[PDB]
Scaffold this active site. Structure first.
Site, PDB file in Angstrom:
ATOM      1  N   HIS A 113      74.982  80.253  31.694  1.00  0.00           N
ATOM      2  CA  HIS A 113      74.914  79.750  33.057  1.00  0.00           C
ATOM      3  C   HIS A 113      74.683  78.243  33.119  1.00  0.00           C
ATOM      4  O   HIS A 113      75.156  77.595  34.060  1.00  0.00           O
ATOM      5  CB  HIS A 113      73.815  80.463  33.849  1.00  0.00           C
ATOM      6  N   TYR A 137      67.653  89.657  42.450  1.00  0.00           N
ATOM      7  CA  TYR A 137      66.733  88.536  42.600  1.00  0.00           C
ATOM      8  C   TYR A 137      66.949  87.786  43.910  1.00  0.00           C
ATOM      9  O   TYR A 137      66.022  87.133  44.395  1.00  0.00           O
ATOM     10  CB  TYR A 137      66.871  87.568  41.422  1.00  0.00           C
ATOM     11  N   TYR A 180      69.073  79.976  49.582  1.00  0.00           N
ATOM     12  CA  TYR A 180      69.386  81.412  49.606  1.00  0.00           C
ATOM     13  C   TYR A 180      69.042  82.097  50.914  1.00  0.00           C
ATOM     14  O   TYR A 180      69.308  83.299  51.059  1.00  0.00           O
ATOM     15  CB  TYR A 180      68.606  82.174  48.539  1.00  0.00           C
ATOM     16  N   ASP A 194      76.961  75.941  40.292  1.00  0.00           N
ATOM     17  CA  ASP A 194      76.048  76.953  40.835  1.00  0.00           C
ATOM     18  C   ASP A 194      76.055  76.757  42.354  1.00  0.00           C
ATOM     19  O   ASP A 194      77.150  76.726  42.940  1.00  0.00           O
ATOM     20  CB  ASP A 194      74.692  76.848  40.137  1.00  0.00           C
TER      21      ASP A 194
HETATM   22  C1  LIG Z   1      76.480  83.560  49.582  1.00  0.00           C
HETATM   23  C2  LIG Z   1      75.542  84.292  48.672  1.00  0.00           C
HETATM   24  C3  LIG Z   1      75.365  83.497  47.369  1.00  0.00           C
HETATM   25  C4  LIG Z   1      75.226  82.875  46.351  1.00  0.00           C
HETATM   26  C5  LIG Z   1      75.046  82.071  45.032  1.00  0.00           C
HETATM   27  C6  LIG Z   1      76.001  81.172  44.657  1.00  0.00           C
HETATM   28  C7  LIG Z   1      75.856  80.435  43.467  1.00  0.00           C
HETATM   29  C8  LIG Z   1      74.724  80.633  42.674  1.00  0.00           C
HETATM   30  C9  LIG Z   1      73.757  81.550  43.062  1.00  0.00           C
HETATM   31  C10 LIG Z   1      72.493  81.758  42.162  1.00  0.00           C
HETATM   32  O1  LIG Z   1      71.735  82.645  42.393  1.00  0.00           O
HETATM   33  N1  LIG Z   1      72.254  80.830  41.036  1.00  0.00           N
HETATM   34  C11 LIG Z   1      71.096  81.003  40.219  1.00  0.00           C
HETATM   35  C12 LIG Z   1      71.487  81.647  38.839  1.00  0.00           C
HETATM   36  C13 LIG Z   1      70.403  81.364  37.829  1.00  0.00           C
HETATM   37  C14 LIG Z   1      69.070  81.899  38.323  1.00  0.00           C
HETATM   38  C15 LIG Z   1      68.923  83.288  38.613  1.00  0.00           C
HETATM   39  C16 LIG Z   1      67.702  83.780  39.058  1.00  0.00           C
HETATM   40  C17 LIG Z   1      66.619  82.915  39.215  1.00  0.00           C
HETATM   41  C18 LIG Z   1      66.763  81.541  38.925  1.00  0.00           C
HETATM   42  C19 LIG Z   1      67.993  81.041  38.475  1.00  0.00           C
HETATM   43  C20 LIG Z   1      70.780  82.021  36.457  1.00  0.00           C
HETATM   44  C21 LIG Z   1      69.940  81.816  35.360  1.00  0.00           C
HETATM   45  C22 LIG Z   1      70.248  82.382  34.104  1.00  0.00           C
HETATM   46  C23 LIG Z   1      71.391  83.138  33.950  1.00  0.00           C
HETATM   47  O2  LIG Z   1      71.708  83.724  32.656  1.00  0.00           O
HETATM   48  C24 LIG Z   1      72.381  84.948  32.737  1.00  0.00           C
HETATM   49  F1  LIG Z   1      73.680  84.733  33.170  1.00  0.00           F
HETATM   50  F2  LIG Z   1      71.740  85.760  33.618  1.00  0.00           F
HETATM   51  F3  LIG Z   1      72.403  85.536  31.512  1.00  0.00           F
HETATM   52  C25 LIG Z   1      72.242  83.344  35.049  1.00  0.00           C
HETATM   53  C26 LIG Z   1      71.932  82.775  36.309  1.00  0.00           C
HETATM   54  C27 LIG Z   1      73.894  82.280  44.236  1.00  0.00           C
HETATM   55  N2  LIG Z   1      76.094  85.621  48.367  1.00  0.00           N
HETATM   56  O3  LIG Z   1      75.503  86.792  48.941  1.00  0.00           O
HETATM   57  C28 LIG Z   1      77.265  85.745  47.464  1.00  0.00           C
HETATM   58  N3  LIG Z   1      77.804  87.036  47.165  1.00  0.00           N
HETATM   59  O4  LIG Z   1      77.755  84.770  46.988  1.00  0.00           O
END
Ligand SMILES: C[C@H](C#Cc1cccc(C(=O)NCC[C@@H](c2ccccc2)c2ccc(OC(F)(F)F)cc2)c1)N(O)C(N)=O
Ligand SMILES: C[C@H](C#Cc1cccc(C(=O)NCC[C@@H](c2ccccc2)c2ccc(OC(F)(F)F)cc2)c1)N(O)C(N)=O
EC number: 3.3.2.10
Lengths: 319, 319
Positions: A296, A155, A238, A107
């Site tokens: 994830h 988000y 972020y 991540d």
């Molecule tokens: C540079 C900038 C960037 C970036 C970047 C790089 C790596 C990771 C992340 C990120 O957000 N990680 C959190 C995902 C997590 C989550 C999401 C929301 C809230 C809390 C946690 C999640 C949870 C369940 C899930 O389950 C499914 F898949 F949804 F079903 C998926 C993901 C952002 N940028 O602009 C571009 N383009 O890279």
């Protein structure tokens, strides 16, 4: 797979800057392997890999990334740009007397280890990322504009103003982590239209069920960890998209030449496998793993598969 | 040789028992080398060896021994018998996920690493002692009786009753360490007739000069360390002679078969070189170093010679 009990671990601390010390957990002997977790996680997210990697003959250093757990969480938002984070990890290696380490990330930690490999290859023996692809910066398209062209990253705009997402994620920590740490088929939260719905959990139960991936005790550990510093430090990762983009642009005409592994997860609906599809053009020695039925939360969703992939790759390309 | 600055070190902590955690400093990669200081010292007594060993390709773990520094100092005297101390060091290795380590000790730490090699050879890759010889227990002669037959070990009887030596060593710490940490030609304290003279420093200046071996800053570090727990824990290492003797007797019909090094110091007038003279009959693979013009404080008296001896032996017999 065997997991970790936190009180039976060796705990290390390294001061990399006047008010910044990094905490890590350390197990095993052999080549140094540094594990970097994502948002909003912990060294403990590696609990199934740490014993397995050490048993395979590696010295595992599982970090609390800056802002998390027992690591310092400075207040300033710019302390969490990728440029600062990577130079601190180089200082970390320096203070440990490590000329190189293998870096494995997931991540946001996956993003970090990619930039470590890009800007400090001489310090990275090999690099592996779970879910997070490596996409070189487009110097013609600003980062917040690239986020609006993709609705699943909405988000991320909700995460931008300090204090807003903190209040929601901190209001009930047990609910926060039980809502997040779920298999894809169990997922309860909407990533789309978070800003029109008011928040991230508005349409999720107040007492969500416990995912098949985790126990109540494991949830409460994360809860205890995030009582220490809250979500501001984690969210600040972020809040540096323009500086990260400007820094990434300074590297543009260059490849990653060190041994590398990209692990995609079939059911990560945000970091989708297709996002990695032309990484070979930038990373000539890139190898691949792919985990079916994996969401994830890769390390705890499919720990045995992750362990098998990492140890096979470490034994051939990093050792 | 290059020395260490304490704030640029990686600090590790391992809980080996409910109210006992061991602190160590860690530098380098390669085979694990565990350094064990004597009385009344610190991990910092290894300051000239830690960078040198790490540069030669070893992973150095320099301990605060139990009772010292940032390590726990439980109150009970029997917590510092050799039997308990060694099993804690095995637990230490266990919690770090280390199958074996090289053990290098000085003074009381030299005694400890000898018993580690004797009772836990499967966990000791190789063993080295500075100054402290290995003399198997005589099951027919009690330990306090063997001490009266040698007048230089008379300070050891002064160390026996709890609180007595503590008051003298704690009354002015700077004076204590400036009086102790001296070359043999600079020595200011009498080890003989300590009990008839009232104490250990009664016939030494109230403001002693600074030895050529040490700076004022290095003295003040020891001073700061011993403000934490005082001298009781350190002195307790001397208060278990009968239990250490009974435990040592349980091993009597056995040799140490692992690679081993004994380093003697020409001018250590307490741990004299001649005391090591028939160690070969018990330690068949024993090798030797010997340092001329070297007093009791071997690591800081002749650091370059110590470094050369240890790295040559590690490279041939431990690696
Ligand atoms: C540079 C900038 C960037 C970036 C970047 C790089 C790596 C990771 C992340 C990120 O957000 N990680 C959190 C995902 C997590 C989550 C999401 C929301 C809230 C809390 C946690 C999640 C949870 C369940 C899930 O389950 C499914 F898949 F949804 F079903 C998926 C993901 C952002 N940028 O602009 C571009 N383009 O890279
Ligand atoms: C089992 C039991 C035992 C034992 C044992 C094992 C290893 C070490 C010691 C020990 O006491 N280490 C301290 C020496 C140190 C010191 C002395 C007094 C006070 C503070 C510090 C010192 C300082 C200057 C100096 O300079 C010179 F050489 F005097 F000139 C020499 C030594 C005791 N036992 O009964 C037998 N037989 O082993």
């Amino acid at each position: 797979p065997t997991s970790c009990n936190p009180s039976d671990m060796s705990h290390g601390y390294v001061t990399v800057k006047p008010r910044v010390r990094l905490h890590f957990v350390e197990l095993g002997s052999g080549p140094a392997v540094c594990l970097c977790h994502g948002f909003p996680e912990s060294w403990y997210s590696w609990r199934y890999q740490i014993p397995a990697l050490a048993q395979a003959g590696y010295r595992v250093l599982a970090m609390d990334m800056k802002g998390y757990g027992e690591s310092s969480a400075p207040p300033e938002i710019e302390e969490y740009c990728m440029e600062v984070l990577c130079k601190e990890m180089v200082t970390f290696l320096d203070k440990l007397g490590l000329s190189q380490a293998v870096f494995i990330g997931h991540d946001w930690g996956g993003m970090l280890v990619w930039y470590m490999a890009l800007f400090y290859p001489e310090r990275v023996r090999a690099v592996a990322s779970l879910n997070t692809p490596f996409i070189p910066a487009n110097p013609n398209m600003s980062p917040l504009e690239s986020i609006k062209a993709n609705p699943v990253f909405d988000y991320q705009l909700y995460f931008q103003e300090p204090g807003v997402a903190e209040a929601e994620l901190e209001q009930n920590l047990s609910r926060t982590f039980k809502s997040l740490f779920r298999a894809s088929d169990e997922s309860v939260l909407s990533m789309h239209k978070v800003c029109e719905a008011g928040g991230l959990f508005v349409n999720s139960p107040e007492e969500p069920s416990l995912s098949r991936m985790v126990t109540e005790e494991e949830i409460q550990f994360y809860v205890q960890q995030f009582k220490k510093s809250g979500f501001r430090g984690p969210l600040n990762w972020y809040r540096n998209m323009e500086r990260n983009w400007k820094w990434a642009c300074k590297s543009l005409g260059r490849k990653i030449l060190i041994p590398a592994l990209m692990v995609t997860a079939e059911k990560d609906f945000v970091l989708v496998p297709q996002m990695s599809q032309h990484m070979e053009d930038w990373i000539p020695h890139l190898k691949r793993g792919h985990i079916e039925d994996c969401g994830h939360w890769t390390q705890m969703d499919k720990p045995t598969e992750v362990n098998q992939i990492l140890i096979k790759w470490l034994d051939s390309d990093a050792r």
